[PDB]
Each structure stands twice: as structure tokens, then as C-alpha cells.
Subunit: 138 residues, 3 copies
């Protein structure tokens, strides 16, 4: 099985902060380390496939967003926040080295929820990101 | 003549995908190589020149978006290119001079600049292509 | 006292142009050098401090946005600069300490920070200027 890039690239950006969070400029997903408890929901990624009725929809994370496990990477390319990626509808998906594809072919379209994998309330403040690219599995 | 930078910089981003395009995020201008036929319309650029009553409104593309009097979107790898044609929705007369696309007549013009595929290029490798244009006048 | 980074980073982008102003993009703030008079208002930065009921809300500008107790927008060339004044429309009391703009009183303040031109600089070369500010507290 190999992932074929065929879609747009989405990004989940989260700004971890101390209890005293000062949101300057535009508004984004901001969370204090304290809120980084297990199962804690981060953002959500909207996916929409077209003309994929004979292929398995899949999402591919940047090389710096997965290892052995998905996680958001700090701007320093150091600190990481381990998260779990699952669709809103209870569709069945598989995780294969940075790839998250649907077990059944079809032009699926829904929401992919991002949650904190295990309490990590000690996560250093900063800007974390998680990039995912559309495509199919085959 | 020469182009004088005096305005904002706009960008036309197109994502080329295979027949099975999976849009992660929301939203962009995605198109399958199959749709990359000749005259195929990509995105559109809205232009608004003001105080240009004695000058000629002009648009300047990045050095990596033009060559030999030909405009094209560049891949994120600064390698693959999609040749496109620049033309206003209204049939106004413009001129192309080395990456510069200026209007033949002076005055403050405003409207939409349509971007179309120049010749069928359905073999264009998938990826993220862009076309940057900067506002200014010609002299 | 030192500034502790704890919030998001905002940015004020301005595009100085000549009287002939050609807007190519969808939306991006533009202004001709002529409008760059003293007290001239640029953009505005929204500030939302939360859980800061025992800390002094503060804003920190990039190293290339301040110098000698003076704030300014920097050109894309890291050369030209537009000196501006930072002030809360709440008329609240703030202090400027080497790139840091913090509130004199603790509390989870939330409002608008107005950006105005510091002294007439109508000769400012055209280009893209920016001013980055990061949320956090002072102590």
C-alpha cells in the first residue's frame, strides 16, 4: 500500500499558553497547558473527497508530524504534542506510517476530530502545527 | 518604459490533483490535470487602481511567474509550470512587456483579471502552483 | 521586570503606495505616502487577555519592530521603517519598556490597540510594512 497525493493540504494550528493567555491580533485556537488533558479536543479538520468512489480516501501527515503516532510540532521543530486523529462519524480508518486512510472506498466527506493523546499539561508554550494532505490509498 | 511598484501584491493559488482529489481544509482552487484543458479558467484577480488618472495601471508578476512574454504558475518546487493567459473580464486593451501586464489607456481602472490555461496541459504534475502579481503603474 | 510569552502573535500589515494605488489582492490594507501624516491611524490590533487577573497584560514586538523606546513597522527589505504610536482606545494606562507594551494594572483586560503614525512621514518609500506583536504578561 502506498499513499498517492491528490488533494489540498490542511493545517491544525494550536497555540499553547500559560493560564494567563493574551490573544493578540486575529483569533486562533488557544489553549493553556492546563487544558492539555487526555482526550482534550483541539481543532477539527474538514475533509471532502471528489471522484473517489473506487479509491480509499486517505490523509498524509508531514514527516515531522508522525513517528512510530501523530503529533503537532512546535515552531522549533522540537516540542511535540501527541494527538489522536478520528472522524466524527464512526467510520473505520487505518494508520500506516503517517497515513490515515479509510477502510472502505467512496467519496467520503466529514470532520476529522483532533484530540490530545494522554495528559500532557507540561507541554511548553509555543506554536504547534499538524499538516495533513489529501489523497488516496492503493 | 518601466514598471513602478505602487500597490498590493495578489496571488493566484491552484492545486493540481488527480481524478480523486481530497480537499483537506477549506478552501482553495483545486483542479484535476484532466480539467487543465486549453482556455480552462483558473481563478480570477480583482484589480482596483485609484488616483491613476494620468498613468497606466499595470500588474507585475514575480520573476518566477514569467519568461519570454509568457505567464505561468510555478510549482512549490520552483520547477513545474502551468502556462496561463491573463486577460480582463471587460475587453479592455492591455500590453504584455516582460512580466508586466499594463493597460494601453491611462486613467484609474478597476475590474477583474481572468486567468485561463494557455494550451491543454493535462499532463501537469500534481502539486501547488502559484502566480503572484503586484500593483503599480507604467511609464 | 521581564516579559513572559503567553499568547498568540498578531500582525499589522500596511502597504504604502504612491498616489497611483493599484490594489491587486482581494484584501490587504493600503495607503499612499500622502496619507502618512502625523497621528494618521493605520490598522488596529485586537487584544483578548484571559486568566490574567493577577498578572500585567503585555505585548511584545519583534526585535525588528522597536528600538530605543520607539515602535515602527518594518519594510519587507528590513531597511525602511514607519514609526508609529501604540495606544489603547480604552485610555487605559500602559508602559513601554524596550519593545514591550504592558498594562500598568493587573487584570484580564480585553480591547483594541490603536496604531497611529508617529510624526508626518509622507516620504516613506512604497512597499509592504509590518508590525508583529506577541501576547504575554509582565513581571
Amino acid at each position: 500500500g502506498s499513499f498517492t497525493p491528490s488533494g489540498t493540504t490542511g493545517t491544525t494550528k494550536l497555540t499553547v499558553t500559560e493560564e494567563c493567555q493574551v490573544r493578540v491580533g486575529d483569533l486562533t485556537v488557544a489553549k493553556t497547558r492546563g487544558q492539555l488533558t487526555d482526550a482534550a479536543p483541539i481543532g477539527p479538520v474538514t475533509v471532502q473527497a471528489l471522484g473517489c468512489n473506487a479509491r480509499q480516501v486517505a490523509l498524509k501527515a508531514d514527516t515531522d508530524n508522525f513517528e512510530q503516532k501523530f503529533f503537532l510540532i512546535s515552531d522549533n521543530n522540537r516540542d511535540k504534542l501527541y494527538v489522536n486523529i478520528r472522524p466524527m462519524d464512526n467510520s473505520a480508518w487505518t494508520t500506516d506510517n503517517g497515513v490515515f486512510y479509510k477502510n472502505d472506498v467512496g467519496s467520503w466527506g466529514g470532520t476529522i476530530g483532533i484530540y490530545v493523546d494522554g495528559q500532557q499539561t507540561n507541554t511548553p508554550p509555543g506554536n504547534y502545527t499538524l499538516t495533513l494532505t489529501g489523497g488516496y490509498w492503493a
